[PDB]
Ligand binder design. Structure first.
Ligand SMILES: C=C(c1ccc(C(=O)O)cc1)c1cc2c(cc1C)C(C)(C)CCC2(C)C
Ligand SMILES: C=C(c1ccc(C(=O)O)cc1)c1cc2c(cc1C)C(C)(C)CCC2(C)C
Lengths: 11, 214, 214, 11
């Protein structure tokens, strides 16, 4: 879960 | 060490260049993407494990945003300035059913930041302190999060006094707005959850995600 | 001026010489009478108009008591010590339906006060700061309340550093427990109101009064 | 209102 948040932190 | 107020200020600058409730929500969603970028610019934040970066952001996003738009509205008479560059006045918030909480924002935050003329460096350090909340549940190493928080207010304390020699208690004054920020941030969350439940009020993807569980 | 840490400490000392929820409530009611006496011992508090003395007490009673029994439980393993001299363990609180909030008290407050070895003088100044909350609604002169708060942490800051030269950030550390105290105090109120609504759980006269409106 | 509180503060 927390799709958006992970994607933004990783990039 | 390696927690200068120069880096924090830059972070604050590097990010921020008809229903009033729906407008405030869209501004919040828009600011969530920028918030992440903001956090990455705070020294050491990115060096923390991804799992804790998620916990800290999900745990303090609300207070981080309330504190930002509050300082941005310092020049507004009786209202706030939204990220979308749009305004929201006290009466308009009242006509939307959120008069009470809106007023608390104006009286406890906005008006206070203006009276003491809180600068962007002070705001940034305050937000970094909130960001590095060691009480957040789930943190793998709450110890390091606590260490980071200490360095932030340490550099802040030095910034103050030196920048404001006439005000020995300016530092403590800043930290003492955090309890109000916590309380107001909590009330904002209760409203949002209710809005989601009801179904009315469009809630964008990112803002919707923060309202997820846990 | 006239806001010494010696007076505050004295105040802290001058006052404090089967259902677990019902027991915690009776201890709260019992401590409310003492809280009033405690406040009168804080310099300048009594010189304020009676109307503001009521607002400040009604506004901060909950956090004032949570902070007191928390520091009193510093020696307890996994629980708290009640004014009635009785104990309440983590498991017993869990078996009563209030496990979550009880744990937050242990993790965010009790355990922290113990780790930093917060002394009675520090606790008193913290409580005096909470007592002198200028954000309280209704206050006739929120300005003076703010002035008093500033003098409290000013004397506290001096007490710290001098008493703890090795800990430059001890002062800021203390103030940074206030946000947790606010949040935990708010959750405690939601529980109490629910208890009152339901009808179960005996609630004494004084505690019942605090739960009145506004 | 606030009976108890006033009585205790006044005395
Ligand atoms: C966290 C909020 C927020 C976040 C960022 C902004 C911004 O424009 O930067 C605006 C508002 C926010 C604030 C509020 C709300 C809803 C939200 C999403 C509601 C609850 C709609 C009204 C009360 C206040 C103004 C505190
Ligand atoms: C404010 C509380 C309180 C106040 C004073 C004492 C004391 O013994 O000094 C004990 C407890 C209090 C605290 C709590 C409760 C109820 C009350 C009345 C409930 C909600 C029953 C459990 C959670 C905690 C332990 C935070």
């Amino acid at each position: 879960k927390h799709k958006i948040l992970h994607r933004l932190l990783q990039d | 060490e390696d927690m200068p107020v120069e880096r924090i200020l830059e972070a604050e600058l590097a990010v921020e260049p008809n229903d009033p409730v729906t407008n405030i929500c869209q501004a919040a969603d828009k600011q969530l993407f920028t918030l992440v970028e903001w956090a990455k610019r705070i020294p050491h934040f990115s060096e923390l494990p991804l799992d804790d970066q998620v916990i800290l952001l999900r745990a303090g996003w609300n207070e981080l945003l309330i504190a930002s738009f509050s300082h941005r509205s310092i020049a507004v008479k009786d209202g706030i300035l939204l990220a979308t560059g749009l305004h929201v006045h006290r009466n308009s918030a009242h006509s939307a059913g959120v008069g009470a909480i809106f007023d608390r924002v104006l009286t406890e935050l906005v008006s206070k930041m203006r009276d003491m003329q809180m600068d962007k460096t002070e705001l940034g350090c305050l937000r970094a302190i909130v960001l590095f909340n060691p009480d957040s549940k789930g943190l793998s190493n709450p110890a390091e999060v606590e260490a980071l928080r200490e360095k932030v207010y340490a550099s802040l304390e030095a910034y103050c006094k030196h920048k404001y020699p006439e005000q020995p208690g300016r530092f403590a004054k800043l930290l003492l707005r955090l309890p109000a920020l916590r309380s107001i941030g909590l009330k904002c969350l209760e409203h949002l959850f209710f809005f989601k439940l009801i179904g009315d009020t469009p809630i964008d993807t990112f803002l919707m995600e923060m309202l997820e569980a846990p």
